[PDB]
Amino acid sequence: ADPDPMKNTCKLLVVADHRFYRYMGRGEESTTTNYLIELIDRVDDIYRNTAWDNAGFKGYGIQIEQIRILKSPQEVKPGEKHYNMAKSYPNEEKDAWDVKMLLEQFSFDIAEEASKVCLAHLFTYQDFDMGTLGLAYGGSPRANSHGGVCPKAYYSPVGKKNIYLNSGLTSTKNYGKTILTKEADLVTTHELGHNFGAEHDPDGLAECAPNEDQGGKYVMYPIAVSGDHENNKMFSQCSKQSIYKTIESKAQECFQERSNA
Ligand SMILES: Cc1cc(COc2ccc([C@]3(C)CCN([C@H](C)C(=O)NO)C3=O)cc2)c2ccccc2n1
Ligand SMILES: [Zn+2]
């Protein structure tokens, strides 16, 4: 405990694809960057005020190091794909990519940039099937799965190179409409939660999945309940415990000193 102030911030590479630029940024850089800057700051407030050990072990947050703004779609040769290409993959007739394949593609395409930052996060605007809002590596119960804060290499047999699992993505479009900013905040918080090591809160542990009359669910709950209840913007005890196991070691590995605001 007692956090290193020279290593308490996970710097992010934030990427806005052409869809986000056009539909959230109104085709303007200022509008695009302002949205992301304010979102990450509000999310940072949640992380910073969180005591991972319920004591004084808090002060860990996130800050943007760079914001890449893709104003137009990535042109590709027949048979070639890129996370910022115009068409969705694998079904170009759908509004969005298969979310898992998009996250994989993003990681592949920005691997070089990702190797130099604590985390890389893609912000897009596409309607993933069945209400999916985001995805991220880390905090997954699945076998052989890994990822999260600090670049972790994975040799892609298909890609023929190393990609890094310190990535995640957020879409601000769901069911044909732009989601509320209060809902966007929760999605990114959730995904970065996986990056920090938390898994979904299980119903089987009432402490980590309270009823609506007890403050509601916490941010790592697998279902988007509302954002209206008091617990929604907080990390449960389960999340805190999981994130506390590796946060210090990870911090020493790739966290940096908070640049002031
Ligand atoms: C808008 C919002 C978001 C959260 C927590 O964040 C998510 C984000 C995505 C999902 C879903 C829809 C479920 C599963 N999912 C993917 C696969 C995922 O879990 N990524 O990490 C999603 O896109 C659920 C909660 C909330 C948590 C508790 C209460 C209200 C909430 N409102
Ligand atoms: Zn999740």
mmCIF file of C-alpha atoms and ligand atoms in Angstrom:
data_model
loop_
_atom_site.group_PDB
_atom_site.id
_atom_site.type_symbol
_atom_site.label_atom_id
_atom_site.label_comp_id
_atom_site.label_asym_id
_atom_site.label_seq_id
_atom_site.Cartn_x
_atom_site.Cartn_y
_atom_site.Cartn_z
ATOM 1 C CA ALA A 1 0.000 0.000 0.000
ATOM 2 C CA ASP A 2 0.893 3.710 0.081
ATOM 3 C CA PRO A 3 1.010 4.490 -3.692
ATOM 4 C CA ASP A 4 4.081 5.725 -5.546
ATOM 5 C CA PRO A 5 3.290 9.280 -6.720
ATOM 6 C CA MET A 6 5.835 8.914 -9.519
ATOM 7 C CA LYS A 7 3.924 5.873 -10.752
ATOM 8 C CA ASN A 8 0.214 6.282 -10.057
ATOM 9 C CA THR A 9 -1.242 7.116 -13.467
ATOM 10 C CA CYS A 10 -1.958 4.861 -16.447
ATOM 11 C CA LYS A 11 -1.411 7.034 -19.524
ATOM 12 C CA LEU A 12 -3.732 6.280 -22.417
ATOM 13 C CA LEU A 13 -3.567 6.344 -26.170
ATOM 14 C CA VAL A 14 -7.120 7.309 -27.089
ATOM 15 C CA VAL A 15 -8.241 6.632 -30.635
ATOM 16 C CA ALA A 16 -11.351 8.057 -32.299
ATOM 17 C CA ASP A 17 -12.150 6.254 -35.556
ATOM 18 C CA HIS A 18 -13.895 7.934 -38.496
ATOM 19 C CA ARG A 19 -17.332 6.875 -37.254
ATOM 20 C CA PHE A 20 -16.813 8.561 -33.896
ATOM 21 C CA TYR A 21 -15.357 11.638 -35.604
ATOM 22 C CA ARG A 22 -18.376 12.004 -37.884
ATOM 23 C CA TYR A 23 -21.233 11.152 -35.531
ATOM 24 C CA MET A 24 -19.917 12.227 -32.124
ATOM 25 C CA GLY A 25 -17.410 14.861 -33.200
ATOM 26 C CA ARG A 26 -19.720 16.431 -35.798
ATOM 27 C CA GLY A 27 -16.768 16.176 -38.148
ATOM 28 C CA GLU A 28 -14.765 18.563 -35.946
ATOM 29 C CA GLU A 29 -11.548 17.920 -34.011
ATOM 30 C CA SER A 30 -12.362 20.259 -31.114
ATOM 31 C CA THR A 31 -15.762 18.685 -30.496
ATOM 32 C CA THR A 32 -14.229 15.215 -30.874
ATOM 33 C CA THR A 33 -11.361 15.794 -28.469
ATOM 34 C CA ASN A 34 -13.452 17.773 -25.938
ATOM 35 C CA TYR A 35 -15.881 14.877 -25.569
ATOM 36 C CA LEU A 36 -13.097 12.356 -24.954
ATOM 37 C CA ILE A 37 -11.145 14.644 -22.645
ATOM 38 C CA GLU A 38 -14.166 15.231 -20.429
ATOM 39 C CA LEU A 39 -15.195 11.574 -20.480
ATOM 40 C CA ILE A 40 -11.757 10.279 -19.430
ATOM 41 C CA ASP A 41 -11.594 12.969 -16.730
ATOM 42 C CA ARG A 42 -14.964 11.909 -15.246
ATOM 43 C CA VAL A 43 -13.843 8.267 -15.360
ATOM 44 C CA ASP A 44 -10.523 9.293 -13.791
ATOM 45 C CA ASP A 45 -12.501 10.784 -10.866
ATOM 46 C CA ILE A 46 -13.991 7.352 -10.166
ATOM 47 C CA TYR A 47 -10.634 5.562 -10.246
ATOM 48 C CA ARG A 48 -8.775 8.211 -8.206
ATOM 49 C CA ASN A 49 -11.314 8.279 -5.362
ATOM 50 C CA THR A 50 -11.330 4.476 -5.129
ATOM 51 C CA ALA A 51 -9.554 2.903 -2.164
ATOM 52 C CA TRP A 52 -8.541 -0.500 -3.544
ATOM 53 C CA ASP A 53 -7.920 -1.777 0.008
ATOM 54 C CA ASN A 54 -10.662 0.283 1.683
ATOM 55 C CA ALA A 55 -7.888 2.106 3.513
ATOM 56 C CA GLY A 56 -5.783 4.886 2.064
ATOM 57 C CA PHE A 57 -4.666 2.959 -0.971
ATOM 58 C CA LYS A 58 -6.199 5.313 -3.532
ATOM 59 C CA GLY A 59 -4.969 7.971 -5.927
ATOM 60 C CA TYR A 60 -4.561 5.692 -8.934
ATOM 61 C CA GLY A 61 -6.101 7.051 -12.102
ATOM 62 C CA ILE A 62 -5.823 7.528 -15.830
ATOM 63 C CA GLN A 63 -4.835 10.407 -18.089
ATOM 64 C CA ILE A 64 -4.693 10.842 -21.840
ATOM 65 C CA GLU A 65 -1.222 10.954 -23.357
ATOM 66 C CA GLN A 66 -2.337 11.190 -26.955
ATOM 67 C CA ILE A 67 -5.592 11.342 -28.886
ATOM 68 C CA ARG A 68 -5.436 9.984 -32.423
ATOM 69 C CA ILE A 69 -8.241 11.338 -34.596
ATOM 70 C CA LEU A 70 -9.038 9.421 -37.781
ATOM 71 C CA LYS A 71 -11.047 11.870 -39.883
ATOM 72 C CA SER A 72 -11.683 9.477 -42.739
ATOM 73 C CA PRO A 73 -11.956 5.696 -43.198
ATOM 74 C CA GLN A 74 -8.807 3.666 -43.810
ATOM 75 C CA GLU A 75 -8.712 2.711 -47.484
ATOM 76 C CA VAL A 76 -7.922 -0.966 -47.947
ATOM 77 C CA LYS A 77 -6.999 -3.285 -50.828
ATOM 78 C CA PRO A 78 -9.466 -6.070 -51.701
ATOM 79 C CA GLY A 79 -9.326 -8.732 -48.990
ATOM 80 C CA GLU A 80 -7.463 -6.513 -46.524
ATOM 81 C CA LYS A 81 -9.025 -5.207 -43.313
ATOM 82 C CA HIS A 82 -8.281 -2.417 -40.819
ATOM 83 C CA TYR A 83 -10.240 -1.348 -37.733
ATOM 84 C CA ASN A 84 -10.838 2.076 -39.288
ATOM 85 C CA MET A 85 -11.984 0.807 -42.692
ATOM 86 C CA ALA A 86 -15.372 1.943 -44.021
ATOM 87 C CA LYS A 87 -17.067 -1.462 -44.031
ATOM 88 C CA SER A 88 -18.003 -3.523 -40.984
ATOM 89 C CA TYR A 89 -16.432 -6.974 -40.656
ATOM 90 C CA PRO A 90 -17.253 -9.807 -41.128
ATOM 91 C CA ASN A 91 -20.707 -8.728 -42.341
ATOM 92 C CA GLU A 92 -20.436 -5.545 -44.407
ATOM 93 C CA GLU A 93 -24.229 -5.330 -44.512
ATOM 94 C CA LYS A 94 -24.388 -4.817 -40.726
ATOM 95 C CA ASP A 95 -23.901 -1.415 -39.071
ATOM 96 C CA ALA A 96 -21.071 -2.757 -36.917
ATOM 97 C CA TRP A 97 -18.176 -5.199 -36.703
ATOM 98 C CA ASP A 98 -18.373 -8.358 -34.635
ATOM 99 C CA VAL A 99 -17.127 -6.727 -31.403
ATOM 100 C CA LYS A 100 -14.504 -9.362 -30.528
ATOM 101 C CA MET A 101 -13.020 -9.277 -34.017
ATOM 102 C CA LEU A 102 -12.940 -5.455 -33.913
ATOM 103 C CA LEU A 103 -11.004 -5.416 -30.622
ATOM 104 C CA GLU A 104 -8.557 -7.964 -32.073
ATOM 105 C CA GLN A 105 -8.185 -5.924 -35.256
ATOM 106 C CA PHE A 106 -7.635 -2.704 -33.321
ATOM 107 C CA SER A 107 -4.886 -4.330 -31.226
ATOM 108 C CA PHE A 108 -3.200 -5.647 -34.346
ATOM 109 C CA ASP A 109 -3.282 -2.316 -36.181
ATOM 110 C CA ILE A 110 -1.976 -0.155 -33.315
ATOM 111 C CA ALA A 111 0.412 -2.719 -31.845
ATOM 112 C CA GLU A 112 3.419 -0.447 -32.371
ATOM 113 C CA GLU A 113 1.762 2.463 -30.567
ATOM 114 C CA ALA A 114 0.342 0.194 -27.837
ATOM 115 C CA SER A 115 3.792 -1.139 -26.945
ATOM 116 C CA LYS A 116 4.677 2.332 -25.635
ATOM 117 C CA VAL A 117 1.637 3.122 -23.458
ATOM 118 C CA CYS A 118 -0.118 1.702 -20.392
ATOM 119 C CA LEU A 119 -3.386 1.338 -22.364
ATOM 120 C CA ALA A 120 -4.883 2.024 -25.766
ATOM 121 C CA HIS A 121 -8.652 2.561 -26.047
ATOM 122 C CA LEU A 122 -10.733 2.805 -29.204
ATOM 123 C CA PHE A 123 -13.826 5.031 -29.245
ATOM 124 C CA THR A 124 -16.192 4.279 -32.108
ATOM 125 C CA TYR A 125 -19.812 4.762 -33.154
ATOM 126 C CA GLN A 126 -21.424 1.561 -34.394
ATOM 127 C CA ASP A 127 -24.390 -0.467 -33.237
ATOM 128 C CA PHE A 128 -22.991 -3.775 -31.988
ATOM 129 C CA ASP A 129 -25.497 -6.612 -32.064
ATOM 130 C CA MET A 130 -27.698 -7.362 -29.044
ATOM 131 C CA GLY A 131 -26.899 -4.259 -27.001
ATOM 132 C CA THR A 132 -23.141 -4.735 -26.599
ATOM 133 C CA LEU A 133 -21.499 -1.469 -25.587
ATOM 134 C CA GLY A 134 -17.812 -2.320 -25.204
ATOM 135 C CA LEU A 135 -15.071 -4.906 -24.813
ATOM 136 C CA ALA A 136 -11.562 -5.138 -23.282
ATOM 137 C CA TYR A 137 -8.739 -7.556 -22.462
ATOM 138 C CA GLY A 138 -8.078 -8.544 -18.854
ATOM 139 C CA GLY A 139 -10.576 -9.460 -16.156
ATOM 140 C CA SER A 140 -11.798 -12.438 -18.172
ATOM 141 C CA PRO A 141 -12.577 -15.811 -16.530
ATOM 142 C CA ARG A 142 -12.039 -17.530 -19.891
ATOM 143 C CA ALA A 143 -9.094 -19.932 -19.993
ATOM 144 C CA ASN A 144 -5.815 -18.917 -21.666
ATOM 145 C CA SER A 145 -7.091 -15.319 -21.766
ATOM 146 C CA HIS A 146 -4.939 -12.395 -20.567
ATOM 147 C CA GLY A 147 -4.377 -8.675 -21.074
ATOM 148 C CA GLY A 148 -4.927 -5.331 -19.390
ATOM 149 C CA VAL A 149 -2.739 -2.479 -18.142
ATOM 150 C CA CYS A 150 0.862 -2.511 -19.407
ATOM 151 C CA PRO A 151 1.638 -3.990 -22.869
ATOM 152 C CA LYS A 152 1.529 -7.785 -22.828
ATOM 153 C CA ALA A 153 2.703 -9.505 -25.986
ATOM 154 C CA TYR A 154 0.762 -12.185 -27.793
ATOM 155 C CA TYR A 155 2.132 -13.674 -30.985
ATOM 156 C CA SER A 156 -0.698 -13.765 -33.502
ATOM 157 C CA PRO A 157 -0.372 -16.928 -35.632
ATOM 158 C CA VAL A 158 -2.700 -15.336 -38.195
ATOM 159 C CA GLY A 159 -1.164 -11.865 -37.979
ATOM 160 C CA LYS A 160 2.428 -13.164 -38.017
ATOM 161 C CA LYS A 161 3.542 -10.570 -35.449
ATOM 162 C CA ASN A 162 3.235 -9.605 -31.810
ATOM 163 C CA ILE A 163 0.170 -7.584 -30.811
ATOM 164 C CA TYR A 164 -0.392 -6.300 -27.263
ATOM 165 C CA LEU A 165 -3.337 -6.997 -24.958
ATOM 166 C CA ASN A 166 -3.404 -3.600 -23.241
ATOM 167 C CA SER A 167 -6.486 -2.536 -25.192
ATOM 168 C CA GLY A 168 -10.237 -2.089 -25.042
ATOM 169 C CA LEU A 169 -12.969 -0.210 -26.910
ATOM 170 C CA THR A 170 -16.150 1.800 -26.379
ATOM 171 C CA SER A 171 -19.063 2.547 -28.705
ATOM 172 C CA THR A 172 -21.371 5.477 -27.964
ATOM 173 C CA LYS A 173 -24.111 4.156 -30.231
ATOM 174 C CA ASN A 174 -26.644 1.530 -29.178
ATOM 175 C CA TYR A 175 -30.036 0.643 -30.677
ATOM 176 C CA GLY A 176 -29.979 3.372 -33.312
ATOM 177 C CA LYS A 177 -29.238 6.259 -30.955
ATOM 178 C CA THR A 178 -26.336 8.055 -29.298
ATOM 179 C CA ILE A 179 -26.159 6.840 -25.689
ATOM 180 C CA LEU A 180 -26.283 9.361 -22.804
ATOM 181 C CA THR A 181 -22.988 10.802 -21.614
ATOM 182 C CA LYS A 182 -23.812 9.348 -18.177
ATOM 183 C CA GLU A 183 -24.065 5.931 -19.844
ATOM 184 C CA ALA A 184 -20.873 6.396 -21.883
ATOM 185 C CA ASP A 185 -18.973 7.124 -18.675
ATOM 186 C CA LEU A 186 -20.077 3.783 -17.221
ATOM 187 C CA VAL A 187 -19.109 1.775 -20.306
ATOM 188 C CA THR A 188 -15.541 3.114 -20.480
ATOM 189 C CA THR A 189 -15.237 2.749 -16.704
ATOM 190 C CA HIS A 190 -16.397 -0.869 -17.086
ATOM 191 C CA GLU A 191 -13.977 -1.715 -19.899
ATOM 192 C CA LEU A 192 -11.035 -0.001 -18.194
ATOM 193 C CA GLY A 193 -12.128 -2.029 -15.173
ATOM 194 C CA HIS A 194 -11.326 -5.218 -17.078
ATOM 195 C CA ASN A 195 -7.999 -3.656 -18.101
ATOM 196 C CA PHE A 196 -7.270 -3.039 -14.416
ATOM 197 C CA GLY A 197 -8.074 -6.684 -13.644
ATOM 198 C CA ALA A 198 -11.726 -6.826 -12.547
ATOM 199 C CA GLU A 199 -14.171 -9.490 -13.686
ATOM 200 C CA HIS A 200 -17.955 -9.175 -13.849
ATOM 201 C CA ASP A 201 -19.785 -8.985 -10.516
ATOM 202 C CA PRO A 202 -21.706 -12.240 -9.872
ATOM 203 C CA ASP A 203 -25.286 -12.420 -8.558
ATOM 204 C CA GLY A 204 -24.116 -15.137 -6.175
ATOM 205 C CA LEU A 205 -22.317 -12.527 -4.061
ATOM 206 C CA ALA A 206 -24.974 -10.087 -2.819
ATOM 207 C CA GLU A 207 -22.270 -7.784 -1.454
ATOM 208 C CA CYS A 208 -20.985 -7.268 -5.000
ATOM 209 C CA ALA A 209 -24.396 -7.255 -6.702
ATOM 210 C CA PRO A 210 -26.860 -5.356 -4.430
ATOM 211 C CA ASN A 211 -30.580 -5.059 -5.113
ATOM 212 C CA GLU A 212 -31.993 -1.833 -6.544
ATOM 213 C CA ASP A 213 -33.216 -0.892 -3.066
ATOM 214 C CA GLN A 214 -29.677 -1.190 -1.702
ATOM 215 C CA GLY A 215 -27.979 1.202 -4.103
ATOM 216 C CA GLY A 216 -28.210 -1.022 -7.165
ATOM 217 C CA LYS A 217 -25.442 -2.773 -9.083
ATOM 218 C CA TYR A 218 -21.802 -1.711 -9.355
ATOM 219 C CA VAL A 219 -19.995 -0.777 -12.590
ATOM 220 C CA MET A 220 -18.595 -4.257 -13.289
ATOM 221 C CA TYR A 221 -22.064 -5.853 -13.394
ATOM 222 C CA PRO A 222 -22.392 -7.594 -16.802
ATOM 223 C CA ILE A 223 -25.702 -5.878 -17.589
ATOM 224 C CA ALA A 224 -26.320 -2.181 -18.283
ATOM 225 C CA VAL A 225 -28.991 -1.567 -15.627
ATOM 226 C CA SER A 226 -29.365 2.247 -15.779
ATOM 227 C CA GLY A 227 -26.662 4.484 -14.310
ATOM 228 C CA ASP A 228 -29.438 5.976 -12.220
ATOM 229 C CA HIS A 229 -28.562 4.187 -8.938
ATOM 230 C CA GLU A 230 -25.884 5.146 -6.405
ATOM 231 C CA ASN A 231 -23.640 2.098 -6.852
ATOM 232 C CA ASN A 232 -23.545 2.204 -10.665
ATOM 233 C CA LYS A 233 -20.535 4.543 -10.703
ATOM 234 C CA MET A 234 -18.590 2.601 -8.067
ATOM 235 C CA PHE A 235 -16.409 -0.480 -8.017
ATOM 236 C CA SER A 236 -17.711 -3.321 -5.850
ATOM 237 C CA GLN A 237 -15.592 -4.994 -3.177
ATOM 238 C CA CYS A 238 -15.090 -7.874 -5.605
ATOM 239 C CA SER A 239 -13.669 -5.539 -8.265
ATOM 240 C CA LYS A 240 -11.468 -3.768 -5.713
ATOM 241 C CA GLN A 241 -9.990 -7.057 -4.468
ATOM 242 C CA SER A 242 -9.224 -8.324 -7.985
ATOM 243 C CA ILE A 243 -7.726 -5.005 -9.043
ATOM 244 C CA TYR A 244 -5.691 -4.710 -5.843
ATOM 245 C CA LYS A 245 -3.856 -7.994 -6.464
ATOM 246 C CA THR A 246 -1.830 -6.620 -9.371
ATOM 247 C CA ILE A 247 -2.308 -2.848 -9.389
ATOM 248 C CA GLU A 248 0.929 -2.125 -7.468
ATOM 249 C CA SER A 249 3.134 -4.424 -9.536
ATOM 250 C CA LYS A 250 1.507 -3.118 -12.716
ATOM 251 C CA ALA A 251 1.970 0.474 -11.561
ATOM 252 C CA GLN A 252 5.686 -0.070 -11.060
ATOM 253 C CA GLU A 253 5.794 -1.726 -14.502
ATOM 254 C CA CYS A 254 4.133 0.986 -16.622
ATOM 255 C CA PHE A 255 2.333 3.672 -14.586
ATOM 256 C CA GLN A 256 3.687 7.229 -14.601
ATOM 257 C CA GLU A 257 3.417 10.422 -12.569
ATOM 258 C CA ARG A 258 0.168 12.343 -12.884
ATOM 259 C CA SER A 259 0.541 15.453 -15.047
ATOM 260 C CA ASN A 260 -1.377 18.238 -13.346
ATOM 261 C CA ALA A 261 -4.668 19.865 -14.229
HETATM 262 C C1 LIG B 1 -24.508 2.238 -19.215
HETATM 263 C C2 LIG B 1 -24.237 1.401 -18.039
HETATM 264 C C3 LIG B 1 -23.070 0.588 -18.015
HETATM 265 C C4 LIG B 1 -22.790 -0.235 -16.873
HETATM 266 C C5 LIG B 1 -21.532 -1.135 -16.816
HETATM 267 O O1 LIG B 1 -20.833 -1.207 -18.081
HETATM 268 C C6 LIG B 1 -21.287 -2.197 -18.981
HETATM 269 C C7 LIG B 1 -20.751 -2.213 -20.297
HETATM 270 C C8 LIG B 1 -21.190 -3.182 -21.242
HETATM 271 C C9 LIG B 1 -22.169 -4.159 -20.879
HETATM 272 C C10 LIG B 1 -22.611 -5.203 -21.888
HETATM 273 C C11 LIG B 1 -23.855 -4.749 -22.621
HETATM 274 C C12 LIG B 1 -22.737 -6.614 -21.235
HETATM 275 C C13 LIG B 1 -21.535 -7.433 -21.747
HETATM 276 N N1 LIG B 1 -20.848 -6.503 -22.626
HETATM 277 C C14 LIG B 1 -19.470 -6.714 -23.014
HETATM 278 C C15 LIG B 1 -19.319 -8.111 -23.610
HETATM 279 C C16 LIG B 1 -18.578 -6.531 -21.804
HETATM 280 O O2 LIG B 1 -18.864 -7.039 -20.723
HETATM 281 N N2 LIG B 1 -17.504 -5.777 -22.035
HETATM 282 O O3 LIG B 1 -16.622 -5.537 -20.996
HETATM 283 C C17 LIG B 1 -21.518 -5.385 -22.935
HETATM 284 O O4 LIG B 1 -21.318 -4.653 -23.892
HETATM 285 C C18 LIG B 1 -22.712 -4.146 -19.561
HETATM 286 C C19 LIG B 1 -22.270 -3.178 -18.617
HETATM 287 C C20 LIG B 1 -23.712 -0.222 -15.779
HETATM 288 C C21 LIG B 1 -23.491 -1.018 -14.614
HETATM 289 C C22 LIG B 1 -24.420 -0.989 -13.533
HETATM 290 C C23 LIG B 1 -25.578 -0.161 -13.604
HETATM 291 C C24 LIG B 1 -25.823 0.645 -14.751
HETATM 292 C C25 LIG B 1 -24.901 0.629 -15.838
HETATM 293 N N3 LIG B 1 -25.109 1.402 -16.983
HETATM 294 ZN ZN ZN B 2 -17.458 -6.612 -19.240
#
